[PDB]
Design a protein around this ligand. Structure first.
Ligand SMILES: O=C(O)c1ccc[n+]([C@@H]2O[C@H](COP(=O)([O-])O)[C@@H](O)[C@H]2O)c1
Ligand SMILES: O=C(O)c1ccc[n+]([C@@H]2O[C@H](COP(=O)([O-])O)[C@@H](O)[C@H]2O)c1
Ligand SMILES: Cc1ccc(N)cc1C
Ligand SMILES: Cc1ccc(N)cc1C
Lengths: 346, 346
């Protein structure tokens, strides 16, 4: 794992310079395509993309797991929904499946800790039947977190060998916006009340209890903000750890990763804390309707491309933004050039 | 034309109700897909879509024309760029062509007033070789505006008969952000300084002259804010009139139209002034980096889906948002249902 983190490559400034120069000469006023240009340059700096903005195969990895904190009344969705939905993922009837198919991406459903019998068709990496209830103790041991990080990392960079050049990250787990709020609170130094939201339609009357649970989780575990792994293991969850592992794997692989919503923001804060070198590979997708979204995004210094008021999770936002990444590539490779049309601008 | 405006159908509330009910029963927490759900319902209300959110063929109509106000020094791009770029449109090397191709849409380049010889391959509807310089008089006569509105309207709804169900609108014309600013200023009652931007890289030192030109155009023509056609003919342009005509045509056809950037906002303000019934058919795409964008969008009560800091024009933003419209349709038709998985939520 220390080896892993050590070998994450820095962006290729040489390729980025050649990219910027090429974009400036395209048939349009310089910089007129805004963030599409910036995105093309960022991609060009990713070693795994071979010095140019391109997109081969696309995959969305969905990390599924249950949470012990569900028993504290922080979620109105029945617990079995995780297992049921995970099975529906294998049938392509869920939100991510439909949006991923529309984008030409393949969905990988990974069980990292669902509290139910194993589901056929689902990649099995379960650590346990749900993580511990963060309200009275840690979600898992540091060892378990480090092991899952490593496992998911290898799985991720291994897909790279099969033609995948763009990753989308997502999750599935009833009650997970609670440990995500705790994590955000700890990494950004924000108070619980400012980052706890309604998750999957939590009644406004039950928000107070959710805020109290987050505070207790922090007070009891005393997670160290300067140690992302400590934070993930104490007040995180298997699914959040797995999302973090995808980001580390793609970064080690020198490939881009599309973030999803609020849960993904949490995992990204942890990943950047564990290894700052990961940041250049992260690409925002949409702006989650979850209350603590603005704060988490500010500490990540990211501005999402899509404002859809989405809050489903599953990696649906990630899949929705994949066409945007391909648009920057098409712009870069298919537009004509100013010089060829004899156009000279000041 | 009075007939045209009179026959614009109202949205089908019955189909929208059936749509909302179906969306609520899909495999996800109710409302969790945010604006994607709202978009699906809006589409379902459009009579031309046959009571359901669907997308058949897609077209982006680009209105090209030159402006007499170019001689006032409000644009740094040479005048011939309009003619040159219009020709490049027929070769698929421009920004809209590349993004439209990526979306599976066909681009229609229409000349409504380019100051040059006719360009082969371009639909010919030229009113004249450029419109009058709005700084010293009207851009065109009311008759010419009404005639082009009608012409473009018929062309638009005629494409509907050939399988087109989704339109994107765009333009091409050096100096057009000047008449667009004048229009926005007049319709929203905002001062020139608040809505004039840098257009296609206008030097910050030349902004003052541009603001003065807009004020003079308004003072001399005295356009009536309550008469959209009066406004278009006096301080607008052929290209802006044509964009307005596409919106009226699609609305009469009961079909959706995707707006583009700042120029399209101007045309949409005019269209809504001429016929309020047009509003339900308009769909925002991106948030233009032009200074007066926020004001124009506020008066239209629209919140764009994409924040890309784009300012190219051509209908490139419209094409970039087409995948989003198809995503709402895929969501609606391909996701599974809660009841089928035995999931019961409060
Ligand atoms: O991705 C988001 O921004 C998001 C925001 C709110 C809720 N969710 C989803 O809903 C679940 C978490 O909600 P909850 O109330 O059980 O904490 C989980 O399975 C997520 O996929 C996801
Ligand atoms: O669509 C926008 O928001 C947009 C914003 C700024 C500039 N433009 C494009 O640039 C041209 C207008 O810029 P200008 O400086 O000549 O007024 C015209 O051909 C448009 O297609 C377009
Ligand atoms: C100069 C210029 C201005 C606008 C557009 N759409 C394209 C070009 C090349
Ligand atoms: C209840 C619920 C919660 C989250 C998700 N992704 C899906 C469902 C069905």
């Amino acid at each position: 794992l220390h080896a892993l983190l050590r070998d994450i490559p820095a962006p290729d400034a040489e390729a980025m310079a050649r990219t910027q120069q090429h974009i400036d000469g395209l048939l349009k006023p310089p910089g007129s395509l805004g963030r599409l240009e910036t995105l093309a340059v960022q991609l060009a700096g990713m070693p795994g993309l071979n010095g140019t903005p391109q997109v081969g195969e696309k995959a969305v990895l969905v990390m599924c797991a249950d949470h012990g904190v569900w028993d504290e009344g922080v979620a109105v969705s029945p617990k079995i929904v995780t297992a049921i939905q995970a099975a529906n993922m294998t049938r392509g009837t869920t939100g991510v499946c439909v949006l991923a198919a529309q984008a030409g991406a393949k969905v990988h459903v990974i069980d990292v800790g669902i509290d139910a019998e194993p589901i056929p068709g689902v990649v099995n990496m379960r650590v346990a039947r749900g993580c511990g209830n963060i309200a009275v103790g840690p979600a898992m041991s540091r060892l378990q977190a480090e092991a899952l990080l490593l496992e998911v990392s290898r799985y991720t960079c291994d897909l790279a060998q099969r033609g995948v050049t763009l990753f989308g990250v997502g999750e599935l787990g009833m009650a997970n916006t609670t440990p995500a709020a705790a994590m955000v609170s700890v990494f950004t130094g924000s108070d619980a009340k400012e980052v706890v939201g309604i998750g999957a339609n939590l009644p406004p009357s039950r928000i107070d209890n959710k805020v109290d649970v987050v505070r207790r989780a922090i007070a009891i575990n005393q997670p160290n903000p300067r140690d992302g792994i400590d934070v993930l293991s104490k007040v995180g969850g298997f699914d959040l750890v797995g999302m973090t592992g995808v980001m580390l794997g793609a970064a080690r692989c020198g490939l881009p990763v599309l973030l999803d919503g609020f849960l993904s923001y949490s995992a990204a804060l942890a990943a950047c804390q564990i290894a700052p070198a990961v940041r250049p590979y992260l690409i925002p997708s949409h702006f989650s309707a979850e209350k603590g979204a603005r704060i988490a995004l500010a500490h990540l210094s990211m501005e999402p491309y899509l404002h859809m008021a989405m809050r489903l999770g599953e990696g649906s936002g990630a899949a929705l933004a994949m066409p945007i990444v391909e648009a920057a590539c098409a712009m870069f490779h298919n537009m004509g050039e100013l010089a060829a049309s004899n156009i000279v601008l000041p």
